[PDB]
């Protein structure tokens with residue numbers, strides 16, 4: 001039985017806008033398969049353009065938020081998880097804030113100065129391509145000051161486990177760095193997600209620095225390849241990356257075990273740790289084509305599933321199965337939708 005605020009996350013609270021996109025959209029905005037981009041000016045028309053389309057699905061998002069609130073949902077004990085993010089003073093931000101309260105997730109949202117609106121993600125869904133365009137908006141205003149407030153920082157201090165996605169590097173690196181240093185200093189469990197290929201390519205220093213404070217690092221095949229190329233791991237890139245990341249020294253240079261898990265879609269995931277000379281394969285659930293509804297957020301769920309079991313003392317393999325279950329649950333659902341806890345099986 002975990003104490004209240006045992007798990008802490010900070011991240012980008014965003015609204016997912018899920019649309020059945022036409023094929024021209026992907027060529028028009030130069031969007032790649034399963035890719036994530038931070039919007040530039042050339043992307044900005046996308047948001048008004050998709051508003052013209054029917055059947056829009058508006059649902060709470062944000063990688064870190066998805067994970068931490070599903071941990072909360074899994075554990076069922078009220079207020080075990082706490083989350084910090086920056087939203088805007090708009091209806092979207094309030095919707096997200098109410099979504100959290102409904103899940104018994106303790107939050108301390110920073111509110112961005114008007115008229116900076118809550119961030120949003122355009123999720124373009126089609127048969128051939130899945131792609132995301134991110135407008136961070138209010139999420140960028142998350143500040144070290146907000147975090148260092150006594151009523152906020154106290155959430156961090158009582159936390160024994162942290163989850164922060166790589167995505168937070170673009171919004172509040174100073175905050176996530178401070179918390180990571182606190183975690184390693186008090187021998188707590190800091191969990192980190194590689195989140196997206198562009199982070200390893202363009203924010204390599206921040207990624208590697210975070211890794212040096214991370215006890216558990218989550219990644220997928222795509223991120224592992226981008227990471228590996230950047231570090232000159234030309235042969236056996238994915239395996240080489242798992243080994244490299246696992247073996248990277250901790251910030252204080254102390255000998256410690258860092259667990260690394262690299263998911264590979266429908267194919268077996270890889271895992272290893274610093275003390276393990278080998279990399280293991282773990283088979284995952286098989287899906288027929290018609291069973292796959294929407295894989296978006298599967299990675300977020302995977303992490304939540306693993307952590308929720310691992311921090312309660314379940315062994316590695318047991319925790320990996322719980323991670324796949326969490327991921328499979330999201331896969332059979334549209335958006336990061338958490339239904340009634342009873343029907344989780």
Ligand SMILES: Nc1ncnc2c1ccn2[C@@H]1O[C@H](CO)[C@@H](O)[C@H]1O
Nearest residue numbers: 263265266284287298299302324327
């Ligand atoms: N097409 C598929 N078939 C079965 N599982 C899938 C997919 C795609 C993703 N996943 C599950 O999500 C986890 C993290 O991506 C992966 O670990 C994995 O469990």
Ligand SMILES: Nc1ncnc2c1ccn2[C@@H]1O[C@H](CO)[C@@H](O)[C@H]1O
Nearest residue numbers: 012014061062063121134167297300
């Ligand atoms: N730059 C970012 N920072 C934080 N979260 C992000 C992004 C971009 C996309 N997402 C979130 O990722 C979820 C899918 O795993 C989607 O639910 C989507 O909201």
Ligand SMILES: [Cl-]
Nearest residue numbers: 011012063064
């Ligand atoms: Cl995030």
